[PDB]
Structures are given as structure tokens and as C-alpha cells.
Amino acid sequence: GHMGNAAAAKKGSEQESVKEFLAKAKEEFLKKWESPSQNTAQLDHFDRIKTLGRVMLVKHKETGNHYAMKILDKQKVVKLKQIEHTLNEKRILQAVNFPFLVKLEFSFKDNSNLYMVMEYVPGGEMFSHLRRIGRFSEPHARFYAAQIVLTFEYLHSLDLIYRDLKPENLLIDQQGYIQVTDFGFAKRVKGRTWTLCGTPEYLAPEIILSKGYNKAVDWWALGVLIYEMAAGYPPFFADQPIQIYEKIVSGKVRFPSHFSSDLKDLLRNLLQVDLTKRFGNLKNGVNDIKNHKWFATTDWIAIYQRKVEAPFIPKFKGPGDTSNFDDYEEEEIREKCGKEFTEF
């Protein structure tokens, strides 16, 4: 067969160890999910530095640690029908723990705003680097992809569907690894869900077609991400979203001539309209992806342990250096909506 005895035994043992890891991680998650942390800091603990609601670089006055502080005006969450999403995003962030998920270090609220203070990821969005460099080599793309695969394996084991994968949402840290941010569309659904949400270029066909769907939309989105990282542009685009959606549902995808056969095979199995054939959605689960030829060189445990030398380290001009982030405006920071946000 494909694997001799030694490789087969090694692979089987690795897949069993994943099961054991995920089981413990669900225990840890559910404890924090069921008893979330609240009110772990306050605004005057922080100097505001620069805008990055709003997200601001801030400096903790006593440790000098920098943070990205997401500031959300309560009354403005209400008018935009976002109470549950905001509550849920904070709840998810304070309960998860994974090396490639941004870390909520503090949260608190006051008469006007809700605050989420997470570790500052100084390297900027993958989006900027990808547009600047143009496209990533397949090894470079694969290093990032492996981190998303592991992160989705983690999230999906907690019955969390992420639903907004794109380079805009992937921050690069000082060691060159990814930090996933923005859980505003994530949802803890065991079965199916129906909400039309996400970013047009990344929507799975079953979302476009107004079907009930499941975590398989995240694996479709990984296919779009891998393609975009390796091509420099996404597999489906057009002037307007309605024309993008026609392409997505069409069941056709074209590849640059520099894509390897292995990569095209993987993408044809992720970008699979037929849910009964889509990798990540089959009997073998995530293992169809992890064991694919395109990931043959990936040491999954070394990725998880962050022992792999990253192919790219963003320029690190210092702590609190904001140069990998672009420049924005200048607003100031002023009880409203108290009942709505008790749980925050």
C-alpha cells in the first residue's frame, strides 16, 4: 500500500494523540465558556497611543506591555443589531486557547463602551504582506495553511464555526506565525446553521445558495485562502459580488500554471461544490487534508509547537511600533444600554 508498517503505525499514533489533545482542550474550553471572566482591568490602566467601533494601540502603564484595545460604543452596537455577536465574540475569545488565536488579556466596560484588550500582534495583516510581495511561494503558503488547518481542527472540535477566513483577518506575529482575529461571525452550532454571513470571495456555494450549512464552509474558505496566497489573487472574483457568486457556484476553478499538481489536487478537493466529496467533510475528517501530498513535508506537531523557522519575519522596529499597520483618523473616547450588556 502507500504506507509501510512503520509509517502506518506512526500516523495512526499521531491521529490518536490528536483525539486525546482535543478532548482535554474541550474540557478546558467548556469550563471557561460556562464561567466567563469579566472586568479584569480598567481604562485608566492604559495609555492610548494610536488608532490601528475602533482598535487602538495602548500601553499598560505598569508593565509597559502593548495591547490592541477594541473599543465598541454600546449604543452603536444596538442600532446596528449586534448585541449577540458582540457578546458572543467576547465569550469565545475569553474561553479559547490556541497558539494561533489572538489572546484576550483583559476586558471591561464603562457607561459608554465595551473594551476588549488583546495581545498586540505587531506584524500587521497577512493581506498587506500578500499584496506587497504579490504572492507567496508554495512552502510559504503551506506554512500559513498548516496553522489554519490546526486552528480549524481545534475550533471545529469545540463546535465553533469561524465563517470569516481571509488574509485581512490573519495577523502575523513577531516570530512570523499567524494570529487569527475577529470572531464576530463565529458560532457554536453542533448541527447546521443558516445565516448569510462572510466575505463574498470566501463564501462557500451552500451559503450563496441559501442552504443550511455546517463547518464545511470553513474548509472551502481554506481552499480560497490557499489559492489566494499562492496565486496572489482569489479563485473567484468579479466587479460585483453577484458575479462572483455565479463563479463560485459554477463548479469551475482555473489555476495559474506555476501551481504544482499537488496544490491543484488539494484545491480541487477543498473547492468542491459537492459536500459529499469536499475534504474536511468526509468520514476521514481533517485527516484527508493533513495527509494530503501537498502537506507531505509538514511536521504538524512542530508547527503547533512553533518550532518551525518561519519563511518570513515582518520588520520589527520595536514594541509598540505600528509601521506594519496603516494610518487612520483621530477620534477621542467619551450609563447606556446597561441591561443589554450585563454578561460582558
Partner: peptide, 18 residues
């Protein structure tokens, strides 16, 4: 070319969610 089509789409910048 496909790359040219991408530039012509006008969706090369940061993409908003629905």
C-alpha cells in the same frame, strides 16, 4: 490575463464582510 482581470475588478483592496 487573470492578474490583469483581478486588477480590473476593483476588488484588490481590503474586502468587507456582508
Amino acid at each position: 490575463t487573470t492578474y490583469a482581470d483581478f486588477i480590473a475588478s476593483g476588488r484588490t483592496g481590503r474586502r468587507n464582510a456582508i
